[PDB]
Amino acid sequence: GSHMKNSVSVDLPGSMKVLVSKSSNADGKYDLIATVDALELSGTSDKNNGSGVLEGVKADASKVKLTISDDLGQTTLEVFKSDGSTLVSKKVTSKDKSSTEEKFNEKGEVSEKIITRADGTRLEYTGIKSDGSGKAKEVLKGYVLEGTLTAEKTTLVVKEGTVTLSKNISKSGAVSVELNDTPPPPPKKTAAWNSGTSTLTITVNSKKTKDLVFTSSNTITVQQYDSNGTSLEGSAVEITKLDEIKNALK
Amino acid sequence: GSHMKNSVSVDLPGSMKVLVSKSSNADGKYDLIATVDALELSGTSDKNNGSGVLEGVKADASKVKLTISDDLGQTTLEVFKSDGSTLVSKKVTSKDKSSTEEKFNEKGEVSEKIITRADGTRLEYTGIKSDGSGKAKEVLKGYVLEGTLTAEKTTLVVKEGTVTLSKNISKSGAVSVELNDTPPPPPKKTAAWNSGTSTLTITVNSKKTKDLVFTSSNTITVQQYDSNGTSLEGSAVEITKLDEIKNALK
């Protein structure tokens, strides 16, 4: 960690601490150093409470800037490219424990974003595009909702069968929810008639279910197919009551 | 019943008997008498086996004619109006026990018909119209099929739910069978969103089923309605797993 001669440690939003000198230097400013992700950042501020701006250079020459607001209520951590201006990442963190993490692209535009709310739930956007669209994920206490982002709204989706539930979050943070059900057509009973055999073959779900035979003795028999609709099983049973015909039509 | 001097009883198709004289009269003919529905019918035939034509008058002046075929294999019983020509009923009966009963109309046209087959099953047509249409009924061993008649065919119908089975009988007596199923659209889950209450109310079959509440603490609760969809029951249960959301969408 960080060490300073005649200093005081000050706790900061989002894990961080800064050391600030007990006294002022030759110019009246106070010395600040902090250690973030094993990199030492340093600066001078007119204030002596821990606020100000600290800077450091990574071993790959990336520039790191930590800005601490006057009231110590917010830290901004920025990582830049070598040039010191093309952003790579930006993390704004608050005392209430809320935060925004952005990652940037070659064009100087945001391509990922993690929003952490005070209560510990998060919204994660990945793969953000020029048109504002992207993948989306809400992390909640005990589970995760998946969906996508457009320029206008985030749409989280849960599926059960033909039922779709959509949670929409607007740019203001307003929730609205919708539901859709596209149920399949129900199982319909069709039939084909063989006049050579005087037989009606009934079908459901592309499986043959039963044969009704209309006999030369003016009787009806019923016989079931195997539950694969492949071929007949048992023997033909003769119909003696109207109710038995209705039953075979169920 | 009927009595004749020096006669012989001869059994006839469809219950009937005729007495025929042992000897011939002055003209060489044989005397026939029979009793049908308590009416005595009489005639003379050249034959002596029981064949010929017998006639009688009812108390209301209706003319009755019984014709017995040469081979004793068929009886025709006709009832006429007073005039002796406008038919009322006609019953042709065979030795195999098969028969046709027709009833006629004011116009001299058939308005009911019972067909009895050798095996004892029947087709009954009632209310027959000028265009050939009518009500229809097949009497089978152990049950009865209902339907209607057109000029081209008889159509007997059995119904079970949305399933219709049709037995068609052509004029030749050829059977053909069809089936129809008009299933209702399946139960679809709709929903309405109340932004004031952050609540999604799900409905099935015009009954409200459950409320999903999307809370200010970034949680979801579910609560069921009474099985009449009238109002809420139990208390709201909080969702802690994705599977529980899927479950409430079943």
List the quaternary state of the chains. Answer: homodimer
CATH superfamily of the largest domain in chain A: C1 set domains (antibody constant domain-like)
The number of domains of chain A: 3
Output the strand order for the largest sheet of chain A.
5-6-7-8-9-10-11-12-13-14-15-16
PDB class: de novo protein
Keywords: Outer surface protein A, OspA, lipid binding protein, DE novo protein
Assembly: dimeric
Entry title: Loop deletion and proline insertion mutant (deleting six residues and inserted five proline residues)
Describe the structure.
Chains A, B: Induces host (human and mouse) cytokine release by monocyte cell lines via TLR2 and CD14; nonlipidated protein does not stimulate host cells. Chains A, B: Keywords: Cell outer membrane, Lipoprotein, Membrane, Palmitate, Plasmid, Signal. 2 copies of one chain form a homodimer. The first copy, chain A, is mainly beta and 250 residues long. Chain A folds into 3 domains: 1-100, Lipocalin; 121-184, Outer Surface Protein A, domain 3, CATH 3.90.930; 190-249, Outer Surface Protein A, domain 3 (Alpha-Beta Complex), CATH 3.90.930.1. Chain A is built from 1 helix and 21 strands. The first copy, chain A, is rod-shaped. Chain A starts with 6 loop residues before the first strand and ends with a helix. The interface between A and B is large, with 51 and 51 residues.
Précis, in short:
Chains A, B: It is found in: Cell outer membrane; Cell surface. Helices cover 3% and strands 55% of the residues of chain A.
Topology:
Two copies of one chain form a homodimer.
Chain A: E1 7-11, E2 17-21, E3 30-36, E4 39-45, E5 52-57, E6 63-68, E7 74-80, E8 87-94, E9 99-104, E10 110-116, E11 122-126, E12 134-140, E13 143-149, E14 153-160, E15 163-170, E16 175-181, E17 190-194, E18 199-204, E19 207-214, E20 220-225, E21 232-238, H1 242-249
Antiparallel strand pairs in A: 1-2, 2-3, 3-4, 5-6, 6-7, 7-8, 8-9, 9-10, 10-11, 11-12, 12-13, 13-14, 14-15, 15-16, 17-18, 18-19, 19-20, 20-21
